[PDB]
Amino acid sequence: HMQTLHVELGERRYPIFIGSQLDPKQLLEPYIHGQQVMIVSNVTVAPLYLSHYQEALESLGKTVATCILPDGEKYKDIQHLNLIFDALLEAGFNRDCTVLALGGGVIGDMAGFASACFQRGVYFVQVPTTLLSQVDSSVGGKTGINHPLGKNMLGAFQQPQVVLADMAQLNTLPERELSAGLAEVIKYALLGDEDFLVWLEENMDGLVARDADLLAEAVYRSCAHKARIVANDEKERALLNLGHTFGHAIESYLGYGTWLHGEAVATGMVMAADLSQRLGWISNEDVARTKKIIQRANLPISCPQIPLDDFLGYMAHDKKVQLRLVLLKQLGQAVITKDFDVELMKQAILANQHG
Ligand SMILES: NC(=O)c1ccc[n+]([C@@H]2O[C@H](COP(=O)([O-])OP(=O)(O)OC[C@H]3O[C@@H](n4cnc5c(N)ncnc54)[C@H](O)[C@@H]3O)[C@@H](O)[C@H]2O)c1
Ligand SMILES: [Mg+2]
Numbered sequence: 322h323m324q325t326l327h328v329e330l331g332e333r334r335y336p337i338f339i340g341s342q343l344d345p346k347q348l349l350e351p352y353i354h355g356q357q358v359m360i361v362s363n364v365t366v367a368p369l370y371l372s373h374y375q376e377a378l379e380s381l382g383k384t385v386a387t388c389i390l391p392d393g394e395k396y397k398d399i400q401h402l403n404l405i406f407d408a409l410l411e412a413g414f415n416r417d418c419t420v421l422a423l424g425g426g427v428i429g430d431m432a433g434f435a436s437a438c439f440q441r442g443v444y445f446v447q448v449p450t451t452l453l454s455q456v457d458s459s460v461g462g463k464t465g466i467n468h469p470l471g472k473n474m475l476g477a478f479q480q481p482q483v484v485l486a487d488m489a490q491l492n493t494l495p496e497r498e499l500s501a502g503l504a505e506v507i508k509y510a511l512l513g514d515e516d517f518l519v520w521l522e523e524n525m526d527g528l529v530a531r532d533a534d535l536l537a538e539a540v541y542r543s544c545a546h547k548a549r550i551v552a553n554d555e556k557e558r559a560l561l562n563l564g565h566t567f568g569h570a571i572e573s574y575l576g577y578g579t580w581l582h583g584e585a586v587a588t589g590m591v592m593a594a595d596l597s598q599r600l601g602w603i604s605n606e607d608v609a610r611t612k613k614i615i616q617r618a619n620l621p622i623s624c625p626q627i628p629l630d631d632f633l634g635y636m637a638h639d640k641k642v643q644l645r646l647v648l649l650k651q652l653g654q655a656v657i658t659k660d661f662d663v664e665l666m667k668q669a670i671l672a673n674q675h676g
Pocket of ligand 2: 582
């Protein structure tokens with residue numbers, strides 16, 4: 322059974338179809354408003370899934386062109402954004418064409434940003450093929466690319482006409498990438514839904530095992546949470562940063578490609594929970610519970626040794642404009658706060674570094 326989540330962001334509205342072995346010819350027909358579709362993918366995802374979408378849209382009568390990018394966060398820059406513009410103009414595509422992002426969050430951001438710039442804005446469709454992009458990139462409307470001096474500093478707000486989330490595509494995902502997605506799923510439960518946490522504890526073995534039905538429920542519940550947070554924020558969104566201030570310092574010190582972002586978020590959530598226990602807000606049992614579910618998702622709960630001077634420098638260089646952290650008053654009840662002892666924060670960092 323396929324599930325549909327209806328998102329309302331900005332003055333725009335779109336469905337997210339979630340299931341397994343979906344038919345893109347059936348699902349996308351109402352959402353391809355013109356004759357032409359540009360499928361953007363990369364050298365890893367395209368040989369696996371491109372023909373599936375190209376053959377479906379061509380059977381629909383559409384003109385399909387493609388732009389296949391190298392695989393990597395390091396290519397998420399304006400030089401490779403330009404390759405999409407090259408492909409779009411080489412194909413002669415017009416104002417009513419659709420750009421279809423086939424891939425993970427890197428492709429989603431690049432194709433989304435390209436779709437906002439081409440002819441000052443064309444249509445955008447998301448087909449996320451990583452778990453993380455399915456539960457994170459599919460709501461929010463942010464698109465972007467990197468600059469040598471700053472990540473995700475160039476981009477556009479661009480909402481899709483539709484998001485198609487097919488769990489079967491997760492079967493070819495590397496194990497670390499799957500776990501990296503589950504880190505974000507766990508995050509939603511820890512910041513705002515203890516019932517969701519209970520469900521993850523009961524079902525984690527099957528999610529790691531890539532049970533199609535359980536994955537689909539986790540994706541639906543994750544997207545529903547983020548859609549609710551951003552919609553309420555428009556009516557805070559900062560709670561989505563649980564674990565990210567700690568995690569950013571981990572990533573920055575370990576360097577490009579050492580840890581996945583979701584792996585850093587996992588350990589950052591442990592540090593956040595640990596600090597929360599030291600502030601007296603949650604119990605040691607709550608921290609143990611948080612470590613256990615993250616570990617069962619095959620995620621790290623401790624990172625290598627990082628000098629505190631460097632760690633704190635990275636947390637202070639990511640400052641919004643006073644340092645505010647996303648911590649836990651209870652499991653499933655995150656808060657953004659300035660009221661923490663910095664000495665206790667250093668203790669929580671050091672406690673979750675392994676030898
Ligand atoms: N716009 C947003 O709100 C938002 C949200 C989250 C992340 N992002 C961006 O997303 C990017 C990270 O996304 P990601 O974690 O999906 O990384 P990614 O897009 O680099 O994908 C991870 C790896 O898996 C490969 N891959 C993807 N799908 C596959 C599949 N089905 N089978 C086998 N291999 C597959 C990709 O080629 C890549 O090597 C970052 O640039 C981040 O800034 C944006
Ligand atoms: Mg994240």
